[PDB]
Symmetry: D2
Subunit: 144 residues, 4 copies
Amino acid sequence: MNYEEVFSITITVDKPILIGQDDIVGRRQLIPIISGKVSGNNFNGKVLPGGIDSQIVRPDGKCELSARYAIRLDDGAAIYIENNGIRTVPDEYIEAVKPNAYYFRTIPTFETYSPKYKWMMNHIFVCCASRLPENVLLKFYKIS
Amino acid sequence: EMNYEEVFSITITVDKPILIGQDDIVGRRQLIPIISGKVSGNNFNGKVLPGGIDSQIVRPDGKCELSARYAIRLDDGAAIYIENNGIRTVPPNAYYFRTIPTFETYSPKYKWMMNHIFVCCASRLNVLLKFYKIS
Amino acid sequence: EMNYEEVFSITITVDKPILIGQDDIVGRRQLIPIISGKVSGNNFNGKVLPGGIDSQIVRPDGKCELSARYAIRLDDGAAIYIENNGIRTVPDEYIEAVKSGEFVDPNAYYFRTIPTFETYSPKYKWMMNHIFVCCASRNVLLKFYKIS
Amino acid sequence: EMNYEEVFSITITVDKPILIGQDDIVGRRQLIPIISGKVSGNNFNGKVLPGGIDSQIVRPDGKCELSARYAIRLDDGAAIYIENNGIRTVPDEYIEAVKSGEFVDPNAYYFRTIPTFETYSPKYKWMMNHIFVCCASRENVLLKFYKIS
């Protein structure tokens, strides 16, 4: 199995909007995306307004993540992204959750509006992520 | 033969669309921020919380597919997370505009929201949403 | 103020469940093959095609989440592909019976679903452009309503 | 970088397609029954159970969107329920072939999917807590499953 690292995004997030928590569904929060820098070989630009990661930390500590946001490239192209994934920590970090620690991986789906980016809607992708301060680093890999 | 009960309404104030892109294959994608919203109904009263976005695509044939993610808080302190998925088609009074919401709740008083099917009838002005519990 | 129209019904015969597995967090997963089915409704008459499966999970709290994929062929030769997703619940007194599978009175059930359609002719494209609700019961009888 | 582990393979025998319908906007929808299948991999050996269907649509532009629901039973008695969703494309020169369904060489395909698992035992709960990628090809479909580390 082969793959190609195609780009990265460093995203600056705002404080979580905590919606609610219990020990049946877990804890729901919305994470607003403030900004984001996109970079890669011929794939450079920024994250657009309107971005939100909708997250639930399940009672067992597993986080399920579903982000919806858009980017615009420096050539003028826009790409809409839905990024669906998981973040799990080992045992001594679980009550904290509810940095090297995490397993944090996602699958993005892309929607594009010009022939130059049609390939993004015709391959499978994996994203390897990390969180920091309040800014997640995302590496995107095209499955070859 | 199909019964239902109207359970609450939300009048939502939206910001201007964040247009992402458009072409003649996928259509036009935009994100609509929800500025605010008033929730009202029999023992179901409160407001829409921050962080709300309706993600819409207008298909080339004109059909709009809608998927909104937002939360509300009630005046009893209960919070509810809503994903509302539906369609809007035209040939204001013009539209067919109907959606299916899915609820996530965090207390026994509201768990019935996770155990029924619902339909939402909407109107685009702001947007007015009437929620019906299918009996 | 919500209007709807009954558009058709389907009476489905199903095989015995294919029990996959169960535990006390995810619940009980089973696949239900659809043997046959008859579609009827004003100018809407046909049959269920081969290949139909309802993938079901009865959650530890007793709620059944249903997802069926199947197709129908109408007497004019048109096909409709259906994914029907919904839920089936019972009052607390019947839950132990459900978790077993001992007989429960069909009137105990709340059994409602939301169908999505895929069609391949102009005469049926409306089914792709309205919202629908399905009221079901124990054959399985499904009644389909277009929301107006 | 991205690391991964091959976890197991499945070789599946499928029946003939159940053609539902086709048009030039939605494409061609068919249901593919899974007759049988053999699961193999280090400490991961079993069979596919009854009830498996791949629901597929070949879009007007030639791209096939695949969604399979089936289950396997391992030799230690554990079950795994699999929802496997993916895509299968060919170069432009083979698209017409893909359409009347003429022979296209196996090496021509891009055929990749993302499986989701449901398991009922602590020994296999890790399958619910990792991301996976599946590489597939075409007498059978060969699926190789990879855990993303």
